[PDB]
Amino acid sequence: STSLSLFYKKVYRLAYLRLNTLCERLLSEHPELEHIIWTLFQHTLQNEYELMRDRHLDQIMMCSMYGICKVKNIDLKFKIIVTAYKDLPHAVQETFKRVLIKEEEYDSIIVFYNSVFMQRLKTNILQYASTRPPTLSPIPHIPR
Amino acid sequence: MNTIQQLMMILNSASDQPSENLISYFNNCTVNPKESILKRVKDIGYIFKEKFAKAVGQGCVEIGSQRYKLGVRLYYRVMESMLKSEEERLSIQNFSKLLNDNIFHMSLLACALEVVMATYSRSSGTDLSFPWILNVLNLKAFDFYKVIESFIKAEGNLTREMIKHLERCEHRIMESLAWLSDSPLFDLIKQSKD
Amino acid sequence: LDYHFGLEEGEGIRDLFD
């Protein structure tokens, strides 16, 4: 299935670049966090794909940053994440102000994290909580 | 380093019909597509003008026709470039399967029309901004995307701004559109999850 | 350039609808 692998391949490059952009400006103090977050991020796109249904790639991204920081006790407020995201050139406010919740219900990206994201991934996000190093996922080559 | 001017000259004199060479490919297929290909161009064009006029404020809009035609001239020029290319890459002359697929021609055409309408943005209700063409043709975002990279390699006369625009459409497909509930992607994922 | 080409030499438009 060339179609499906071409698609994923590219969705990863895009996702990583945006993640790397936010992590380099928000988490420079803890350079290690990017690879763990990217791991949770990729795990999601690949195994909890139903989460993307009628939702935006950036919503899962910011939700992964906010998550791993939580289990690693790194103080990162969602309000801080939103403000940075706004700087990306394609960024639209609506992506964190109006996010899908259940059927036709939308609310801030916070209600999404707490009501949907954290629950579907709570179990897994816990792994990283273990004071033992994780099986970091491979970063998208992206050279040239 | 390309200018809008050259692609405009190429399309201005290009033919509205498949070239002698393209027909050559249609006749080499296990199943002949020349029939469905011509009829599809005829019907979509019929649907496209009415929709264009409707989206564009109101009434009769003589400009919808001129655009669709440019779309078609690009469509054919790109299809032939892709085929010539595939032939030297796989060394076969058939291609029956590819050329009989409704979605493939539907995607090529849309992409080609999206480019033509882009150049003339500075030309109510709302018109074309990228997603529009999808709804107009009843074509899914995930299928459109499958045609983007090849379209860019097949057409050596695209401007820097046009490749840029094409990439932006691709990024929007990847960010959300290909993830809507109506998207073939979820079947492609399930088919693979097994 | 500056555009990401994800297709590899052994891949072509024909495999996408294959």
JSON list of C-alpha atoms in Angstrom, two decimals, chain A residues 11-144:
[
{"chain": "A", "resi": 11, "resn": "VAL", "atom": "CA", "xyz": [2.46, 13.31, 7.77]},
{"chain": "A", "resi": 12, "resn": "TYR", "atom": "CA", "xyz": [5.42, 12.39, 10.06]},
{"chain": "A", "resi": 13, "resn": "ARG", "atom": "CA", "xyz": [7.81, 14.90, 8.49]},
{"chain": "A", "resi": 14, "resn": "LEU", "atom": "CA", "xyz": [5.25, 17.70, 8.78]},
{"chain": "A", "resi": 15, "resn": "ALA", "atom": "CA", "xyz": [4.34, 16.73, 12.34]},
{"chain": "A", "resi": 16, "resn": "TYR", "atom": "CA", "xyz": [7.90, 16.44, 13.53]},
{"chain": "A", "resi": 17, "resn": "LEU", "atom": "CA", "xyz": [8.96, 19.79, 12.00]},
{"chain": "A", "resi": 18, "resn": "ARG", "atom": "CA", "xyz": [6.15, 21.59, 13.77]},
{"chain": "A", "resi": 19, "resn": "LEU", "atom": "CA", "xyz": [6.90, 19.73, 17.02]},
{"chain": "A", "resi": 20, "resn": "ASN", "atom": "CA", "xyz": [10.56, 20.53, 16.77]},
{"chain": "A", "resi": 21, "resn": "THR", "atom": "CA", "xyz": [9.70, 24.14, 16.14]},
{"chain": "A", "resi": 22, "resn": "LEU", "atom": "CA", "xyz": [7.63, 24.43, 19.31]},
{"chain": "A", "resi": 23, "resn": "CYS", "atom": "CA", "xyz": [9.99, 22.38, 21.48]},
{"chain": "A", "resi": 24, "resn": "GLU", "atom": "CA", "xyz": [13.05, 24.43, 20.51]},
{"chain": "A", "resi": 25, "resn": "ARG", "atom": "CA", "xyz": [11.35, 27.63, 21.65]},
{"chain": "A", "resi": 26, "resn": "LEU", "atom": "CA", "xyz": [9.43, 26.28, 24.65]},
{"chain": "A", "resi": 27, "resn": "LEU", "atom": "CA", "xyz": [11.55, 23.45, 26.06]},
{"chain": "A", "resi": 28, "resn": "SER", "atom": "CA", "xyz": [15.17, 24.46, 25.40]},
{"chain": "A", "resi": 29, "resn": "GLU", "atom": "CA", "xyz": [15.87, 24.02, 29.13]},
{"chain": "A", "resi": 30, "resn": "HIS", "atom": "CA", "xyz": [15.01, 20.31, 28.83]},
{"chain": "A", "resi": 31, "resn": "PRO", "atom": "CA", "xyz": [16.34, 19.26, 25.40]},
{"chain": "A", "resi": 32, "resn": "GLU", "atom": "CA", "xyz": [15.47, 15.66, 26.19]},
{"chain": "A", "resi": 33, "resn": "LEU", "atom": "CA", "xyz": [11.68, 16.13, 26.13]},
{"chain": "A", "resi": 34, "resn": "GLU", "atom": "CA", "xyz": [11.28, 16.43, 22.33]},
{"chain": "A", "resi": 35, "resn": "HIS", "atom": "CA", "xyz": [12.13, 12.80, 21.58]},
{"chain": "A", "resi": 36, "resn": "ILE", "atom": "CA", "xyz": [9.78, 11.44, 24.27]},
{"chain": "A", "resi": 37, "resn": "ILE", "atom": "CA", "xyz": [6.92, 13.69, 23.10]},
{"chain": "A", "resi": 38, "resn": "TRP", "atom": "CA", "xyz": [7.56, 12.72, 19.48]},
{"chain": "A", "resi": 39, "resn": "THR", "atom": "CA", "xyz": [7.33, 9.12, 20.63]},
{"chain": "A", "resi": 40, "resn": "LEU", "atom": "CA", "xyz": [3.88, 9.65, 22.21]},
{"chain": "A", "resi": 41, "resn": "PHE", "atom": "CA", "xyz": [2.88, 11.72, 19.18]},
{"chain": "A", "resi": 42, "resn": "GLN", "atom": "CA", "xyz": [3.81, 8.99, 16.70]},
{"chain": "A", "resi": 43, "resn": "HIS", "atom": "CA", "xyz": [2.31, 6.27, 18.88]},
{"chain": "A", "resi": 44, "resn": "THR", "atom": "CA", "xyz": [-0.95, 8.12, 18.60]},
{"chain": "A", "resi": 45, "resn": "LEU", "atom": "CA", "xyz": [-1.04, 8.70, 14.89]},
{"chain": "A", "resi": 46, "resn": "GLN", "atom": "CA", "xyz": [-0.15, 5.05, 14.45]},
{"chain": "A", "resi": 47, "resn": "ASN", "atom": "CA", "xyz": [-2.15, 3.26, 17.10]},
{"chain": "A", "resi": 48, "resn": "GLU", "atom": "CA", "xyz": [-4.83, 5.63, 18.37]},
{"chain": "A", "resi": 49, "resn": "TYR", "atom": "CA", "xyz": [-5.75, 6.94, 14.91]},
{"chain": "A", "resi": 50, "resn": "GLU", "atom": "CA", "xyz": [-9.45, 7.16, 15.80]},
{"chain": "A", "resi": 51, "resn": "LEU", "atom": "CA", "xyz": [-8.41, 10.16, 17.85]},
{"chain": "A", "resi": 52, "resn": "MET", "atom": "CA", "xyz": [-7.70, 12.13, 14.67]},
{"chain": "A", "resi": 53, "resn": "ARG", "atom": "CA", "xyz": [-11.23, 11.54, 13.36]},
{"chain": "A", "resi": 54, "resn": "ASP", "atom": "CA", "xyz": [-12.69, 14.94, 12.47]},
{"chain": "A", "resi": 55, "resn": "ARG", "atom": "CA", "xyz": [-9.81, 16.50, 14.44]},
{"chain": "A", "resi": 56, "resn": "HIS", "atom": "CA", "xyz": [-6.59, 18.39, 13.69]},
{"chain": "A", "resi": 57, "resn": "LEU", "atom": "CA", "xyz": [-2.98, 17.19, 13.70]},
{"chain": "A", "resi": 58, "resn": "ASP", "atom": "CA", "xyz": [-1.93, 20.24, 15.74]},
{"chain": "A", "resi": 59, "resn": "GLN", "atom": "CA", "xyz": [-4.48, 19.43, 18.49]},
{"chain": "A", "resi": 60, "resn": "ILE", "atom": "CA", "xyz": [-2.87, 16.01, 19.09]},
{"chain": "A", "resi": 61, "resn": "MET", "atom": "CA", "xyz": [0.57, 17.65, 18.91]},
{"chain": "A", "resi": 62, "resn": "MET", "atom": "CA", "xyz": [-0.01, 20.27, 21.59]},
{"chain": "A", "resi": 63, "resn": "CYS", "atom": "CA", "xyz": [-1.81, 17.64, 23.66]},
{"chain": "A", "resi": 64, "resn": "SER", "atom": "CA", "xyz": [1.24, 15.35, 23.60]},
{"chain": "A", "resi": 65, "resn": "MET", "atom": "CA", "xyz": [3.57, 18.18, 24.71]},
{"chain": "A", "resi": 66, "resn": "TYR", "atom": "CA", "xyz": [1.25, 19.08, 27.55]},
{"chain": "A", "resi": 67, "resn": "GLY", "atom": "CA", "xyz": [1.03, 15.41, 28.52]},
{"chain": "A", "resi": 68, "resn": "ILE", "atom": "CA", "xyz": [4.64, 14.22, 28.77]},
{"chain": "A", "resi": 69, "resn": "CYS", "atom": "CA", "xyz": [5.54, 17.46, 30.52]},
{"chain": "A", "resi": 70, "resn": "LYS", "atom": "CA", "xyz": [2.91, 16.48, 33.10]},
{"chain": "A", "resi": 71, "resn": "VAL", "atom": "CA", "xyz": [4.37, 13.08, 33.94]},
{"chain": "A", "resi": 72, "resn": "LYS", "atom": "CA", "xyz": [7.88, 14.54, 33.98]},
{"chain": "A", "resi": 73, "resn": "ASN", "atom": "CA", "xyz": [6.70, 17.34, 36.27]},
{"chain": "A", "resi": 74, "resn": "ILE", "atom": "CA", "xyz": [7.92, 19.99, 33.80]},
{"chain": "A", "resi": 75, "resn": "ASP", "atom": "CA", "xyz": [5.79, 23.09, 34.34]},
{"chain": "A", "resi": 76, "resn": "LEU", "atom": "CA", "xyz": [4.20, 23.90, 30.98]},
{"chain": "A", "resi": 77, "resn": "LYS", "atom": "CA", "xyz": [0.83, 25.59, 30.87]},
{"chain": "A", "resi": 78, "resn": "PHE", "atom": "CA", "xyz": [-1.51, 25.08, 27.92]},
{"chain": "A", "resi": 79, "resn": "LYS", "atom": "CA", "xyz": [-1.94, 28.82, 27.73]},
{"chain": "A", "resi": 80, "resn": "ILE", "atom": "CA", "xyz": [1.80, 29.05, 27.07]},
{"chain": "A", "resi": 81, "resn": "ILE", "atom": "CA", "xyz": [1.60, 26.39, 24.40]},
{"chain": "A", "resi": 82, "resn": "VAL", "atom": "CA", "xyz": [-1.28, 28.12, 22.63]},
{"chain": "A", "resi": 83, "resn": "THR", "atom": "CA", "xyz": [0.50, 31.48, 22.46]},
{"chain": "A", "resi": 84, "resn": "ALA", "atom": "CA", "xyz": [3.54, 29.91, 20.78]},
{"chain": "A", "resi": 85, "resn": "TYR", "atom": "CA", "xyz": [1.49, 27.84, 18.33]},
{"chain": "A", "resi": 86, "resn": "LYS", "atom": "CA", "xyz": [-0.14, 31.14, 17.25]},
{"chain": "A", "resi": 87, "resn": "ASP", "atom": "CA", "xyz": [3.27, 32.14, 15.84]},
{"chain": "A", "resi": 88, "resn": "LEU", "atom": "CA", "xyz": [3.38, 29.29, 13.31]},
{"chain": "A", "resi": 89, "resn": "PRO", "atom": "CA", "xyz": [2.53, 30.76, 9.85]},
{"chain": "A", "resi": 90, "resn": "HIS", "atom": "CA", "xyz": [-0.42, 28.45, 9.13]},
{"chain": "A", "resi": 91, "resn": "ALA", "atom": "CA", "xyz": [-1.85, 28.68, 12.65]},
{"chain": "A", "resi": 92, "resn": "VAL", "atom": "CA", "xyz": [-5.55, 29.39, 13.12]},
{"chain": "A", "resi": 93, "resn": "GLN", "atom": "CA", "xyz": [-6.97, 30.26, 16.55]},
{"chain": "A", "resi": 94, "resn": "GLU", "atom": "CA", "xyz": [-9.95, 28.02, 15.96]},
{"chain": "A", "resi": 95, "resn": "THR", "atom": "CA", "xyz": [-7.66, 24.92, 16.19]},
{"chain": "A", "resi": 96, "resn": "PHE", "atom": "CA", "xyz": [-7.41, 25.27, 20.01]},
{"chain": "A", "resi": 97, "resn": "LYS", "atom": "CA", "xyz": [-10.64, 27.22, 20.70]},
{"chain": "A", "resi": 98, "resn": "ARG", "atom": "CA", "xyz": [-13.04, 24.80, 18.90]},
{"chain": "A", "resi": 99, "resn": "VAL", "atom": "CA", "xyz": [-12.03, 21.14, 19.21]},
{"chain": "A", "resi": 100, "resn": "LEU", "atom": "CA", "xyz": [-14.28, 18.09, 18.92]},
{"chain": "A", "resi": 101, "resn": "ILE", "atom": "CA", "xyz": [-15.44, 16.40, 22.07]},
{"chain": "A", "resi": 102, "resn": "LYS", "atom": "CA", "xyz": [-18.19, 13.78, 21.62]},
{"chain": "A", "resi": 103, "resn": "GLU", "atom": "CA", "xyz": [-20.59, 14.01, 18.65]},
{"chain": "A", "resi": 104, "resn": "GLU", "atom": "CA", "xyz": [-21.22, 17.62, 17.63]},
{"chain": "A", "resi": 105, "resn": "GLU", "atom": "CA", "xyz": [-19.81, 19.26, 20.78]},
{"chain": "A", "resi": 106, "resn": "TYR", "atom": "CA", "xyz": [-16.77, 21.59, 20.67]},
{"chain": "A", "resi": 107, "resn": "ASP", "atom": "CA", "xyz": [-14.85, 23.30, 23.44]},
{"chain": "A", "resi": 108, "resn": "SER", "atom": "CA", "xyz": [-11.35, 24.62, 24.17]},
{"chain": "A", "resi": 109, "resn": "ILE", "atom": "CA", "xyz": [-8.37, 22.32, 23.64]},
{"chain": "A", "resi": 110, "resn": "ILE", "atom": "CA", "xyz": [-8.20, 21.88, 27.43]},
{"chain": "A", "resi": 111, "resn": "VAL", "atom": "CA", "xyz": [-11.59, 20.25, 27.74]},
{"chain": "A", "resi": 112, "resn": "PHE", "atom": "CA", "xyz": [-10.37, 17.97, 24.95]},
{"chain": "A", "resi": 113, "resn": "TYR", "atom": "CA", "xyz": [-7.20, 16.95, 26.75]},
{"chain": "A", "resi": 114, "resn": "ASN", "atom": "CA", "xyz": [-8.97, 16.26, 30.04]},
{"chain": "A", "resi": 115, "resn": "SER", "atom": "CA", "xyz": [-12.16, 14.75, 28.57]},
{"chain": "A", "resi": 116, "resn": "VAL", "atom": "CA", "xyz": [-10.84, 12.64, 25.72]},
{"chain": "A", "resi": 117, "resn": "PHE", "atom": "CA", "xyz": [-7.08, 12.60, 25.12]},
{"chain": "A", "resi": 118, "resn": "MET", "atom": "CA", "xyz": [-5.78, 11.81, 28.58]},
{"chain": "A", "resi": 119, "resn": "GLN", "atom": "CA", "xyz": [-8.29, 9.01, 28.97]},
{"chain": "A", "resi": 120, "resn": "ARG", "atom": "CA", "xyz": [-7.56, 7.16, 25.78]},
{"chain": "A", "resi": 121, "resn": "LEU", "atom": "CA", "xyz": [-3.83, 7.45, 26.43]},
{"chain": "A", "resi": 122, "resn": "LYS", "atom": "CA", "xyz": [-3.62, 7.50, 30.25]},
{"chain": "A", "resi": 123, "resn": "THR", "atom": "CA", "xyz": [-2.51, 3.89, 30.38]},
{"chain": "A", "resi": 124, "resn": "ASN", "atom": "CA", "xyz": [0.26, 4.42, 27.83]},
{"chain": "A", "resi": 125, "resn": "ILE", "atom": "CA", "xyz": [1.41, 7.88, 28.91]},
{"chain": "A", "resi": 126, "resn": "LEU", "atom": "CA", "xyz": [2.14, 6.17, 32.21]},
{"chain": "A", "resi": 127, "resn": "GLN", "atom": "CA", "xyz": [4.97, 4.08, 30.74]},
{"chain": "A", "resi": 128, "resn": "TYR", "atom": "CA", "xyz": [7.07, 7.22, 30.31]},
{"chain": "A", "resi": 129, "resn": "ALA", "atom": "CA", "xyz": [6.37, 8.01, 33.96]},
{"chain": "A", "resi": 130, "resn": "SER", "atom": "CA", "xyz": [8.53, 5.07, 34.96]},
{"chain": "A", "resi": 131, "resn": "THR", "atom": "CA", "xyz": [11.92, 6.39, 36.13]},
{"chain": "A", "resi": 132, "resn": "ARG", "atom": "CA", "xyz": [13.37, 4.12, 33.40]},
{"chain": "A", "resi": 133, "resn": "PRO", "atom": "CA", "xyz": [14.32, 5.27, 29.86]},
{"chain": "A", "resi": 134, "resn": "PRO", "atom": "CA", "xyz": [11.76, 4.56, 27.08]},
{"chain": "A", "resi": 135, "resn": "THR", "atom": "CA", "xyz": [11.98, 2.98, 23.60]},
{"chain": "A", "resi": 136, "resn": "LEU", "atom": "CA", "xyz": [12.15, 6.33, 21.82]},
{"chain": "A", "resi": 137, "resn": "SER", "atom": "CA", "xyz": [10.52, 6.22, 18.36]},
{"chain": "A", "resi": 138, "resn": "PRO", "atom": "CA", "xyz": [12.75, 6.92, 15.33]},
{"chain": "A", "resi": 139, "resn": "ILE", "atom": "CA", "xyz": [12.79, 10.53, 14.12]},
{"chain": "A", "resi": 140, "resn": "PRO", "atom": "CA", "xyz": [11.81, 11.22, 10.49]},
{"chain": "A", "resi": 141, "resn": "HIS", "atom": "CA", "xyz": [15.08, 11.39, 8.55]},
{"chain": "A", "resi": 142, "resn": "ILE", "atom": "CA", "xyz": [14.24, 14.70, 6.84]},
{"chain": "A", "resi": 143, "resn": "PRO", "atom": "CA", "xyz": [17.63, 15.68, 5.36]},
{"chain": "A", "resi": 144, "resn": "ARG", "atom": "CA", "xyz": [18.34, 17.53, 2.08]}
]
